[PDB]
């Protein structure tokens, strides 16, 4: 007996958070976003990559609503308060030490 | 401030290897099935619904990461996981979409 087409297109919602997850890069954003809001560039910074590229990152996030945004002037300040991102960076800390 | 040091990019690599593995829908399906019940290579591709072909690379890609262990008799490979990992991501999965 095959799984449900049901199962299936759940596979599909959780590989897609994880898939925004899984990347190390990522990762380190999802990490400093839950611990401190940041502006782009001091974010660039801290996980040590160029602005294309982060903004590369924080769109696929976005994708997968894992980041708020607020704005002050035309500064935008990146966070995260993502239950899922939490849960699976909790997952990570018990599985790699924290 | 003090960008992040280059032992937690490393450790964002391994965690991000481990992801990867899992940051898919058949494998999520394969790894479900997996855990902990033996399965054939043919039972399983038919219970996830893939050809020997697709099972075979995605098998092959759990196995880079060490997520899954073999049993042989005779003429059979029973597949299964017991992965201490596998298992705490797919609890986080599990109570993030119920």
Redesign the interface.
């Given at each position: 007996?095959?799984?449900s087409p049901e199962?299936?297109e759940?596979?599909?919602?959780?590989?897609g958070?994880?898939?925004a997850?899984?990347?190390?890069?990522?990762?380190?954003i999802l990490?400093?976003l839950v611990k401190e809001e940041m502006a782009v560039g001091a974010l660039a910074?801290?996980?040590?990559l160029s602005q294309s590229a982060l903004s590369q990152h924080l769109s696929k996030l976005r994708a997968q609503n894992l980041v708020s945004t607020r704005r002050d002037a035309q500064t935008i300040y990146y966070s995260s308060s993502s239950?899922?991102v939490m849960?699976?960076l909790?997952?990570?800390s018990?599985?790699?030490g924290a």
């Open positions: 007996q095959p799984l199962k299936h759940e596979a599909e919602i959780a590989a958070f994880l898939s997850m899984a990347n190390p890069k990522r990762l380190l990490d400093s910074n801290k996980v040590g239950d899922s849960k699976i909790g997952a990570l018990e599985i790699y």
